Design a protein around this nucleic acid. Sequence first.
DNA 1: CCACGGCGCC
RNA 2: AAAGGGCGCCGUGG
Length: 538
Amino acid sequence: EEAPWPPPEGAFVGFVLSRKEPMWADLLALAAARGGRVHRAPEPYKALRDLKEARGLLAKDLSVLALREGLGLPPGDDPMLLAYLLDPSNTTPEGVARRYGGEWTEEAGERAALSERLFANLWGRLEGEERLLWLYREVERPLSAVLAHMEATGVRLDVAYLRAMSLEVAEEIARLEAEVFRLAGHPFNLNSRDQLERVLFDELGLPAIGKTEKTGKRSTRAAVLEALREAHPIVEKILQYRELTKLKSTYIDPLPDLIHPRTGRLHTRFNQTATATGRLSSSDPNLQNIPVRTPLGQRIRRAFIAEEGWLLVALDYSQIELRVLAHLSGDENLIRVFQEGRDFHTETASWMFGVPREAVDPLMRRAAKTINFGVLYGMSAHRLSQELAIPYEEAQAFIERYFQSFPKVRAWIEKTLEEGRRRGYVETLFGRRRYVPDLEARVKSVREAAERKAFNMPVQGTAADLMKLAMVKLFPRLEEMGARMLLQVHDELVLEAPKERAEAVARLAKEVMEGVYPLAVPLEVEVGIGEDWLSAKE
DNA sequence: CCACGGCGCC
RNA sequence: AAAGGGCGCCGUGG
Ligand SMILES: Nc1ccn([C@H]2CC[C@@H](COP(=O)(O)OP(=O)(O)OP(=O)(O)O)O2)c(=O)n1
Ligand SMILES: [Cl-]
Ligand SMILES: [Cl-]
Ligand SMILES: [Mg+2]
Ligand SMILES: [Mg+2]
Ligand SMILES: [Mg+2]
């Protein structure tokens, strides 16, 4: 069953890393399988040079390690991508092997054999699924090479700035904690919401605003505290303490340790088979949880900087999910908002707060956004009434008035649920599927939860599909200009270009992103250039 | 790791 | 008056 290295062209690779992060790992073993015959590499790094592509489970990760080693080894077929298209609950090689056959072990030869076996199995299961195969060939497979480039290229950090920030934030946390304990009259677990609830609402007697979801306790969530800002001096201190503590522990302190000593850069890991709707995920750091608006969240982006002689170019799709909803629903009022170049959240804020659009400040706009997303995407009158501190019947009436402004959105939700009940799944514009078997559940809460998943997925997943396709379309032209693609998070992409090319790069990227796919509304992209991510994000 | 819950980012 | 989606974190249980 064994055979000498090197393998024939087209064989499936298997590999074992010393740790899960390819930029940080040694390649313990490398092997390839073809016709069930397995070829094991005598010297893994040397053997990488024999391969023309990385074809097999986790191909992107081997490509990342190859790039570190100065080798252009593009990722090719990967059964993980096939499995994820078949059903996005398929997210790990372990889970995929368990579901479809075989076993994910710690031996390279066995992994190579499994890759071959899973490719055949899953490819067969996809026969005739032309829309999923289009996603595979035109989005997922080429995107894997883009993600390999992003992860291996990494991004420069201003480590001196982070070190200073850590000292400054620690000092401020200490001051805040001390002042909180003084205002409270005693020390307590400032990280315990149960203890906070007691201090705020029993001991200091502040009025409670909201109830927690499941247990109906007095909520201490940020929105409640924000509304109690002027009720007691302790409140603003708690809010600040919570945020500083969180960002220090998750970003400010860990980031400098993630700088790779060989590259001098941070190598964020991107995963394209991780979420239920098709959104990309990042880890080490998870970029998702860096706040956009707060001073410290902004200071964190200031720590992400361009290489000397380069600039960062940051591009953000403006309200892409709402534009997708306009497209999918065909709602005329929604389409009109974007055709007329208006801001959805400002327009609706003006409507719901009864003030002119110019009077909609960022605080009001933030409040409106939270209401819009909650209402559009399925919040009940009960929850809305509690959070808005209004009677139930008033919240129920607001919801009806809201959808009366966008009548075809409701029609779209209903049609989507009707077809989903029939088919057992829902789909994005490009045909990415999420299975929703609980649409036929008899238990009311179980069925209704399935419905909310079902009509949310086509919007979020289509937005994600669009970003991924834009990345695929942009990448080769970027490389032609000597530029790099570094980060993707939220609705944003961050590139790095030589200073002399940055303006041309910004123009090209905006164009490619705005024209990625024709919709019933235009796509808008905001673009900025700077030596750091914050300066570029403006 | 799994469950539960509140809370936090988009 | 059963609780928007996605992704996380922590706490509590094991
Ligand atoms: N509470 C929230 C917040 C966000 N989102 C989803 C919907 C839009 C997407 C991106 O968030 P934002 O960029 O903040 O929203 P936006 O519509 O693009 O508004 P803005 O112009 O302020 O960015 O995340 C959501 O479902 N629920
Ligand atoms: Cl650098
Ligand atoms: Cl379901
Ligand atoms: Mg936005
Ligand atoms: Mg949970
Ligand atoms: Mg938040």
